[PDB]
Amino acid sequence: TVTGAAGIGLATLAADGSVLDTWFPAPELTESGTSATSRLAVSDVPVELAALIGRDDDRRTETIAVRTVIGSLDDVAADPYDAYLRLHLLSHRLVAPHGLNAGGLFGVLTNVVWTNHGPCAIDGFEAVRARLRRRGPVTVYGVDKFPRMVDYVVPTGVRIADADRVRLGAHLAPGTTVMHEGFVNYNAGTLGASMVEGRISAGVVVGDGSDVGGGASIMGTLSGGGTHVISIGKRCLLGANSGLGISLGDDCVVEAGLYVTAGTRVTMPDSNSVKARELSGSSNLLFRRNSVSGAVEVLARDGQGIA
Amino acid sequence: VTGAAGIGLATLAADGSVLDTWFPAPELTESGTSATSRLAVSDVPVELAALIGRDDDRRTETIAVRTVIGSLDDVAADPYDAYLRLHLLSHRLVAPHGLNAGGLFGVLTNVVWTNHGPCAIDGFEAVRARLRRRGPVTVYGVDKFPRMVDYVVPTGVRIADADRVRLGAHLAPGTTVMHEGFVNYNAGTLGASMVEGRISAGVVVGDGSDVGGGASIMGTLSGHVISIGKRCLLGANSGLGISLGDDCVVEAGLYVTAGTRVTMPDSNSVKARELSGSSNLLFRRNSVSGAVEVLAR
Amino acid sequence: VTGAAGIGLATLAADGSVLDTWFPAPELTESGTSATSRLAVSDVPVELAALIGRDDDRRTETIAVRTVIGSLDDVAADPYDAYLRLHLLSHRLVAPHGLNAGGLFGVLTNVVWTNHGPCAIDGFEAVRARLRRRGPVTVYGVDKFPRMVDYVVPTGVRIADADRVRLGAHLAPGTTVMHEGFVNYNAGTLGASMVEGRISAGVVVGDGSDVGGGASIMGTLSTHVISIGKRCLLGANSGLGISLGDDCVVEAGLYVTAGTRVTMPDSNSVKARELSGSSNLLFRRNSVSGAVEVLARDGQGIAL
Ligand SMILES: CC(C)(COP(=O)(O)OP(=O)(O)OC[C@H]1O[C@@H](n2cnc3c(N)ncnc32)[C@H](O)[C@@H]1OP(=O)(O)O)[C@@H](O)C(=O)NCCC(=O)NCCSC(=O)CCC(=O)O
Ligand SMILES: [Mg+2]
Ligand SMILES: [Mg+2]
Ligand SMILES: [Mg+2]
Ligand SMILES: [Mg+2]
Ligand SMILES: [Mg+2]
Ligand code: NA
Ligand code: NA
């Protein structure tokens, strides 16, 4: 019942040996085993990667072929190669969010200056910049521990209008469209076809047929329940500029412009109120703010009733 | 009706599908017959002649064509035609709704847009490994619509982050799109506007009207395409699900959906949809009573 | 009175307009005399000498200059001076409002920022066709302010999407700007902050304060600049049109405008502006009554 994983990768190391990134063209799941990354011998390097190995004197970096193995996906990432493999498994949809331990990545990953000449270390970057500029403009896409998903894999059946907004480790199921205002973090994303125009925080999962409206916030700052991760089930709709700090079951809706936090008091059809966290995971709910009273209300959506 | 025509440089995928077409100089014409033809050698402009070739790593080819649209009222027949329509809008030769922009999702190819040019989704991972021999491979987006500025930069405009303006967006002189603004195709401004929020496809904003940061026009669950008239202001993080006339204001943080019940000065309420298109209105949520209300300006 | 100086690599348009200047190592100096001069050959640093030249396709030239600002309290006189000011802020040599950042819009050239370097608006469509001989032509933006990280990467910082930080933003160590974060010029953080919403020009956020996803901070109090003190939290999709002192919270989804009438624990109401700069406040919209309320935090009671 323990599953492992393995992949041949092209890793870029900084001048001090720090792992900046690793691209695995064909990761795969394997029987449980022993975690380690090794340098591949010449005869084991796929021909497509052999042409990509080298040293960049201006960036002071080297690109090397490795094989990374994870003994158990339940274990925490040991090092950055292991971290990059786990992120690739998610974005390749070989594992769904929470199907592997995605804990502790901030601590294991290197902060990288991502440029139009490849990953660079922070250390010595201003001298690197001046050297690279002999080649043409130096553009820095971002400075962060997580790069852009699409620079490692483009999953099929998917559209991403502005790929700055999908981190490697995001899981986008076939039929998903991420629009310009959409954002998907690592260990997060969609299980089926969703229009994603709002923000899916790390660990958040959105079920098949559910749409996230423009500017909508799922599990944002001050949204509530610190501890447990929230998810939304199937056929849910979050209105534009809405927010959500509790899980939703199937067939729920949050009105445009409404932020439902776990601690928000919600008035029910019977006139009683509960904290929204008491509704977390329920189905068939519509949340709105009454435009006459200003009260946050929840209504049943199927003609049946809340519970 | 009016037709259009233009000479374009198209990129075809390995299977012949049209990935994109750049038309440096589209123009309007008398009505005629829709068709795209490959240009003969003597008809290729000299600026474009150096750009034609085949890319063996991407498995694509770039070719010079002339696309004619017989009538701007017809639906786009093919991707060349679709690209020509989007160029007419961004060139401001045609205003939103000034041509038929329906059916494009169905006509346009889903494209992997890269720092090496457009690529097909099919065989992309093998293409990526081959291109990496040239340097890093960066994918800007995977979608049916590219970035307007990569085809035309219209005059009198600023766009702080050009990832946020689709080809097909119409931005009148004096318009500034800030980093949080977004303008879809067949949509945009007719005059000078500060755009820091989201203009959905089909939506037009009149001269002098400003869209505050994070504002949503016609977003999901907001409520016939809507439009904003002249000298309006949508507050930051606000939303609009109805049309506004001239001189309207929506308070920061308020979402006026078509189904929102609004209290008028006399204490009577109405659904906001009944006010659609009115001028001189201020919408706010009263911070004391909690009620969405409208005031005269 | 403090001045500043820097050797820079300037790119000029075909008509001589300054498109940008990159200053690798700006420095503060004694009060002095403002001027930009072309460096003689012997004064060009070896790393910049290799970068000087003329681009015939773009119709631009890159030149080595030294720019001196006589007094940081004076308004920028021209684009070289403006770019130096912006670099002083982003290098954290000056904090926001530590130099006069007025009139920059009027001084700076509107630039087509491309993967081939800065280009002029003038004649750009022909330039694009020539540059496509080299490969794809990607336009990042068309604006007077370029992306900070293309001039300096400050240490101790993360920026998930660097399209969203203008040159002139001041990001103190421990700062993370996430994809939804935005930081304008003459604005930013004084210490460690998680920034996932929008910091307008002139706006400063104190050590340990976090700006939630999609939150909106207005630049001024509808003419006093808005700031946030230490340990404040703005919830996702919230908005702030008044200053906050320390240890304040604005609830997710609530926009506090200067004119909003807020009800207080004693049930009297004030305009929110009357609370501007106070500490220990929590603003929320009551989910039963619809009213915007302010609560005292941590038994601290409330000061106007
Ligand atoms: C609703 C308005 C438009 C009101 O404008 P005014 O100029 O009247 O402001 P004012 O003088 O403060 O308000 C007039 C009177 O109404 C009262 N008042 C105001 N709002 C109220 C409310 N919701 N309920 C009850 N009373 C209210 C005030 O106390 C004052 O009372 P007295 O009668 O007693 O005097 C404003 O508060 C607003 O929302 N503006 C938003 C601006 C905005 O977002 N601009 C977009 C660019 S900014 C941006 O994009 C942000 C950065 C970013 O997001 O990136
Ligand atoms: Mg069910
Ligand atoms: Mg970008
Ligand atoms: Mg946004
Ligand atoms: Mg610190
Ligand atoms: Mg204090
Ligand atoms: Na399905
Ligand atoms: Na971007």
CSV table of C-alpha atoms in Angstrom, one decimal, chain B residues 14-296:
chain,number,residue,atom,x,y,z
B,14,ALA,CA,2.9,20.1,-38.0
B,15,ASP,CA,-0.6,18.9,-39.0
B,16,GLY,CA,-1.4,22.1,-40.8
B,17,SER,CA,-3.7,23.7,-38.1
B,18,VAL,CA,-3.4,27.5,-37.9
B,19,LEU,CA,-1.7,28.5,-34.7
B,20,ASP,CA,-1.7,32.3,-35.3
B,21,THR,CA,-1.6,35.0,-37.9
B,22,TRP,CA,0.0,38.5,-37.5
B,23,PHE,CA,-1.4,41.1,-39.8
B,24,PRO,CA,0.8,44.2,-39.8
B,25,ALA,CA,-1.7,46.3,-41.7
B,26,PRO,CA,-5.4,45.2,-41.8
B,27,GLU,CA,-8.0,47.4,-43.3
B,28,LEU,CA,-11.7,47.7,-44.0
B,29,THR,CA,-13.0,47.1,-47.5
B,30,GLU,CA,-16.2,47.0,-49.5
B,31,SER,CA,-18.2,43.8,-49.0
B,32,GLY,CA,-16.6,40.9,-51.0
B,33,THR,CA,-15.9,37.2,-50.8
B,34,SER,CA,-14.4,35.5,-47.8
B,35,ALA,CA,-11.2,33.5,-48.5
B,36,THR,CA,-7.6,33.2,-47.4
B,37,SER,CA,-4.9,32.6,-50.1
B,38,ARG,CA,-1.2,32.0,-50.0
B,39,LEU,CA,0.7,35.0,-51.5
B,40,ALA,CA,2.7,34.5,-54.6
B,41,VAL,CA,6.4,35.5,-54.3
B,42,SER,CA,5.9,38.8,-56.1
B,43,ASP,CA,3.1,39.9,-53.6
B,44,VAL,CA,4.9,39.3,-50.3
B,45,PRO,CA,5.9,42.6,-48.8
B,46,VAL,CA,9.7,42.8,-48.3
B,47,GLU,CA,9.4,43.1,-44.5
B,48,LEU,CA,7.7,39.8,-44.4
B,49,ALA,CA,9.8,37.9,-46.9
B,50,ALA,CA,12.6,37.5,-44.4
B,51,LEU,CA,10.2,36.0,-41.8
B,52,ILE,CA,8.9,33.0,-43.9
B,53,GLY,CA,10.5,29.6,-43.2
B,54,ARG,CA,10.1,26.3,-41.4
B,55,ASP,CA,11.2,25.6,-37.8
B,56,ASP,CA,12.4,22.0,-37.6
B,57,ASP,CA,12.4,22.0,-33.7
B,58,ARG,CA,8.9,23.3,-33.3
B,59,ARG,CA,7.7,21.4,-36.4
B,60,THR,CA,6.0,24.5,-37.6
B,61,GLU,CA,6.1,26.7,-40.7
B,62,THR,CA,5.5,30.4,-41.2
B,63,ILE,CA,3.7,31.5,-44.5
B,64,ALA,CA,2.5,34.7,-46.0
B,65,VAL,CA,-1.3,34.8,-46.7
B,66,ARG,CA,-3.9,37.4,-47.6
B,67,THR,CA,-7.2,37.0,-45.8
B,68,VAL,CA,-10.4,38.7,-47.0
B,69,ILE,CA,-13.7,38.9,-45.0
B,70,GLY,CA,-16.6,39.4,-47.3
B,71,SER,CA,-18.8,40.7,-44.5
B,72,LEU,CA,-18.0,41.7,-40.9
B,73,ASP,CA,-21.5,40.5,-40.0
B,74,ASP,CA,-20.7,36.9,-40.9
B,75,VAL,CA,-19.2,34.6,-38.3
B,76,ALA,CA,-15.5,33.9,-38.6
B,77,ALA,CA,-15.1,30.9,-40.9
B,78,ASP,CA,-11.6,29.8,-39.9
B,79,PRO,CA,-8.7,30.9,-37.7
B,80,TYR,CA,-7.2,33.3,-40.3
B,81,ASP,CA,-10.5,35.1,-40.4
B,82,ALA,CA,-10.8,35.0,-36.6
B,83,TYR,CA,-7.3,36.6,-36.2
B,84,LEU,CA,-8.2,39.3,-38.8
B,85,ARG,CA,-11.3,40.3,-36.8
B,86,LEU,CA,-9.3,40.5,-33.5
B,87,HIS,CA,-6.7,42.7,-35.2
B,88,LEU,CA,-9.4,45.1,-36.6
B,89,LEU,CA,-10.7,45.5,-32.9
B,90,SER,CA,-7.2,46.1,-31.5
B,91,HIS,CA,-6.3,48.4,-34.3
B,92,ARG,CA,-9.5,50.3,-33.4
B,93,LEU,CA,-10.6,50.1,-37.0
B,94,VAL,CA,-13.7,48.6,-35.6
B,95,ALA,CA,-15.3,49.1,-32.2
B,96,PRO,CA,-16.6,46.3,-30.0
B,97,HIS,CA,-19.8,44.9,-31.4
B,98,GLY,CA,-18.8,46.5,-34.7
B,99,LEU,CA,-18.2,43.1,-36.2
B,100,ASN,CA,-19.4,39.6,-35.4
B,101,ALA,CA,-17.2,38.2,-32.7
B,102,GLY,CA,-19.2,35.1,-31.9
B,103,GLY,CA,-18.0,31.5,-32.4
B,104,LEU,CA,-14.2,32.1,-31.9
B,105,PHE,CA,-13.8,29.6,-29.2
B,106,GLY,CA,-15.0,27.1,-31.8
B,107,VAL,CA,-12.7,28.3,-34.5
B,108,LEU,CA,-9.4,29.1,-32.9
B,109,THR,CA,-6.7,26.6,-32.1
B,110,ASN,CA,-5.5,26.0,-28.5
B,111,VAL,CA,-1.8,27.2,-28.7
B,112,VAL,CA,1.3,26.8,-26.4
B,113,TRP,CA,2.6,30.4,-26.6
B,114,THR,CA,6.5,30.3,-26.0
B,115,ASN,CA,9.6,32.5,-26.0
B,116,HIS,CA,10.3,30.6,-29.3
B,117,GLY,CA,6.9,31.4,-30.9
B,118,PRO,CA,3.6,29.6,-31.0
B,119,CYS,CA,3.6,25.8,-30.8
B,120,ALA,CA,0.9,23.1,-31.0
B,121,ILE,CA,-0.1,21.1,-28.0
B,122,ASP,CA,0.5,17.9,-29.8
B,123,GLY,CA,4.1,16.7,-29.4
B,124,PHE,CA,4.9,19.7,-27.2
B,125,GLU,CA,7.1,17.8,-24.6
B,126,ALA,CA,9.4,16.6,-27.4
B,127,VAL,CA,9.4,20.1,-28.9
B,128,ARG,CA,10.4,21.5,-25.5
B,129,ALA,CA,13.4,19.2,-25.2
B,130,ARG,CA,14.6,20.2,-28.7
B,131,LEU,CA,14.1,23.9,-28.1
B,132,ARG,CA,16.0,23.7,-24.8
B,133,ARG,CA,19.1,23.2,-27.0
B,134,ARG,CA,18.6,27.0,-27.8
B,135,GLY,CA,18.2,28.2,-24.3
B,136,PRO,CA,15.5,28.1,-21.7
B,137,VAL,CA,12.0,27.3,-22.8
B,138,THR,CA,9.4,29.6,-21.3
B,139,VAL,CA,5.6,29.1,-21.9
B,140,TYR,CA,3.6,32.4,-21.5
B,141,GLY,CA,0.2,30.7,-21.7
B,142,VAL,CA,-1.7,27.9,-23.3
B,143,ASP,CA,-4.9,29.3,-24.9
B,144,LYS,CA,-6.8,30.2,-28.0
B,145,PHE,CA,-6.1,34.0,-27.6
B,146,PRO,CA,-2.6,35.5,-27.4
B,147,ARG,CA,-1.4,38.9,-26.0
B,148,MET,CA,-2.5,41.9,-28.0
B,149,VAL,CA,0.7,43.7,-27.7
B,150,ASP,CA,2.5,40.9,-29.5
B,151,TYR,CA,0.5,41.9,-32.7
B,152,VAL,CA,-0.1,45.7,-32.2
B,153,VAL,CA,0.7,48.4,-29.8
B,154,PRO,CA,-2.1,50.9,-30.3
B,155,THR,CA,-1.2,54.6,-29.9
B,156,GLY,CA,-2.0,56.8,-26.8
B,157,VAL,CA,-2.2,53.8,-24.4
B,158,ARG,CA,-0.3,52.5,-21.5
B,159,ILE,CA,-0.5,48.8,-20.4
B,160,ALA,CA,1.5,48.1,-17.3
B,161,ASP,CA,1.4,44.4,-17.6
B,162,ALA,CA,0.6,43.3,-21.1
B,163,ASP,CA,-0.2,39.7,-20.0
B,164,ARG,CA,-3.6,41.2,-19.2
B,165,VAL,CA,-4.9,42.4,-22.5
B,166,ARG,CA,-6.1,39.8,-25.0
B,167,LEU,CA,-5.7,40.3,-28.7
B,168,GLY,CA,-9.2,41.6,-29.8
B,169,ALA,CA,-9.3,44.2,-26.9
B,170,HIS,CA,-10.1,47.8,-28.1
B,171,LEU,CA,-8.2,50.5,-26.1
B,172,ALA,CA,-9.0,54.1,-27.1
B,173,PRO,CA,-6.3,56.8,-26.9
B,174,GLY,CA,-5.8,58.1,-23.3
B,175,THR,CA,-6.5,54.7,-21.9
B,176,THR,CA,-4.2,53.2,-19.2
B,177,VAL,CA,-4.6,49.6,-18.1
B,178,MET,CA,-2.8,49.2,-14.8
B,179,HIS,CA,-1.4,45.8,-13.5
B,180,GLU,CA,-4.7,44.7,-12.0
B,181,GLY,CA,-6.8,45.8,-15.1
B,182,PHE,CA,-7.8,43.1,-17.6
B,183,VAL,CA,-9.5,43.5,-21.0
B,184,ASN,CA,-10.9,40.6,-22.9
B,185,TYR,CA,-11.5,40.5,-26.7
B,186,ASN,CA,-14.4,42.4,-28.3
B,187,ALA,CA,-14.3,44.7,-25.3
B,188,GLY,CA,-12.6,47.8,-23.9
B,189,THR,CA,-12.7,51.6,-23.9
B,190,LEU,CA,-14.2,54.1,-26.3
B,191,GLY,CA,-12.3,57.0,-24.8
B,192,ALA,CA,-9.8,57.9,-22.1
B,193,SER,CA,-10.1,55.6,-19.1
B,194,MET,CA,-8.0,54.3,-16.2
B,195,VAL,CA,-8.6,50.5,-16.2
B,196,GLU,CA,-7.6,48.7,-13.0
B,197,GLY,CA,-10.3,46.2,-13.0
B,198,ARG,CA,-11.8,43.5,-15.3
B,199,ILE,CA,-13.6,44.2,-18.5
B,200,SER,CA,-15.4,41.0,-19.7
B,201,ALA,CA,-15.8,40.1,-23.4
B,202,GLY,CA,-18.4,42.3,-25.0
B,203,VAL,CA,-18.2,45.0,-22.4
B,204,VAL,CA,-17.5,48.6,-23.4
B,205,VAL,CA,-16.6,51.5,-21.1
B,206,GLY,CA,-17.3,55.1,-22.2
B,207,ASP,CA,-15.0,58.0,-22.2
B,208,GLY,CA,-13.8,59.3,-18.9
B,209,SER,CA,-15.0,56.3,-17.0
B,210,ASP,CA,-12.6,54.7,-14.6
B,211,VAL,CA,-12.5,51.1,-13.4
B,212,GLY,CA,-11.1,50.8,-9.9
B,213,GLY,CA,-8.5,48.2,-8.8
B,214,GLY,CA,-9.9,44.7,-8.7
B,215,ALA,CA,-13.4,45.8,-9.9
B,216,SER,CA,-15.4,43.2,-11.7
B,217,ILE,CA,-17.7,44.0,-14.7
B,218,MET,CA,-20.1,41.2,-15.7
B,219,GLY,CA,-18.3,38.6,-13.7
B,220,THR,CA,-19.6,35.2,-12.5
B,221,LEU,CA,-23.1,35.4,-10.9
B,222,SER,CA,-23.4,39.1,-11.6
B,223,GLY,CA,-26.9,38.6,-13.1
B,224,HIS,CA,-27.6,41.0,-22.8
B,225,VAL,CA,-24.0,42.3,-22.4
B,226,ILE,CA,-23.6,45.4,-20.2
B,227,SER,CA,-21.9,48.7,-20.9
B,228,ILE,CA,-20.7,51.7,-18.9
B,229,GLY,CA,-21.3,55.2,-20.2
B,230,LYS,CA,-19.2,58.4,-19.7
B,231,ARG,CA,-17.6,59.7,-16.5
B,232,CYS,CA,-18.5,56.8,-14.4
B,233,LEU,CA,-16.4,55.4,-11.6
B,234,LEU,CA,-16.4,51.8,-10.3
B,235,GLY,CA,-14.8,51.7,-6.9
B,236,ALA,CA,-11.9,49.4,-6.1
B,237,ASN,CA,-13.0,45.8,-5.5
B,238,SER,CA,-16.6,46.7,-6.6
B,239,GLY,CA,-18.7,44.7,-9.1
B,240,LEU,CA,-21.2,45.6,-11.7
B,241,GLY,CA,-23.9,43.3,-13.1
B,242,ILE,CA,-26.1,46.0,-14.8
B,243,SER,CA,-25.4,48.7,-17.4
B,244,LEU,CA,-24.7,52.2,-16.2
B,245,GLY,CA,-25.4,55.4,-18.1
B,246,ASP,CA,-23.3,58.5,-17.7
B,247,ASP,CA,-22.1,59.9,-14.4
B,248,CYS,CA,-22.6,56.9,-12.2
B,249,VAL,CA,-20.5,55.7,-9.2
B,250,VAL,CA,-20.3,52.3,-7.5
B,251,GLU,CA,-18.8,52.4,-4.0
B,252,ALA,CA,-15.6,50.6,-3.3
B,253,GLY,CA,-16.2,47.0,-2.3
B,254,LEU,CA,-19.9,46.9,-3.4
B,255,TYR,CA,-21.1,44.2,-6.0
B,256,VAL,CA,-24.3,45.4,-7.7
B,257,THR,CA,-25.8,42.2,-9.3
B,258,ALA,CA,-28.8,42.5,-11.6
B,259,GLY,CA,-30.8,40.7,-8.8
B,260,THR,CA,-29.7,42.9,-6.0
B,261,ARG,CA,-32.6,44.8,-4.4
B,262,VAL,CA,-31.8,48.5,-4.2
B,263,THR,CA,-33.4,51.1,-1.9
B,264,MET,CA,-34.2,54.4,-3.5
B,265,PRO,CA,-34.4,57.8,-1.9
B,266,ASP,CA,-38.2,57.5,-1.2
B,267,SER,CA,-37.7,54.2,0.6
B,268,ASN,CA,-39.1,52.1,-2.2
B,269,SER,CA,-36.8,49.3,-3.5
B,270,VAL,CA,-36.3,47.7,-6.9
B,271,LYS,CA,-34.1,45.1,-8.5
B,272,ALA,CA,-31.0,46.8,-9.8
B,273,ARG,CA,-31.8,45.5,-13.3
B,274,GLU,CA,-34.7,48.0,-13.4
B,275,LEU,CA,-32.1,50.7,-13.0
B,276,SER,CA,-29.9,49.3,-15.8
B,277,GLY,CA,-28.8,52.2,-18.1
B,278,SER,CA,-29.7,55.1,-15.8
B,279,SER,CA,-27.5,58.1,-15.4
B,280,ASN,CA,-26.5,60.1,-12.3
B,281,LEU,CA,-26.7,57.3,-9.8
B,282,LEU,CA,-24.5,56.6,-6.8
B,283,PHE,CA,-24.7,53.0,-5.5
B,284,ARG,CA,-23.5,52.1,-2.0
B,285,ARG,CA,-24.2,49.8,0.9
B,286,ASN,CA,-25.3,51.9,3.8
B,287,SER,CA,-22.8,51.2,6.5
B,288,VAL,CA,-25.3,51.7,9.3
B,289,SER,CA,-28.4,49.9,8.1
B,290,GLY,CA,-26.7,47.3,5.8
B,291,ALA,CA,-29.0,48.2,2.9
B,292,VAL,CA,-27.9,48.6,-0.7
B,293,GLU,CA,-29.2,52.0,-1.7
B,294,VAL,CA,-28.9,54.4,-4.6
B,295,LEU,CA,-28.6,58.2,-4.3
B,296,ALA,CA,-28.9,60.9,-7.0
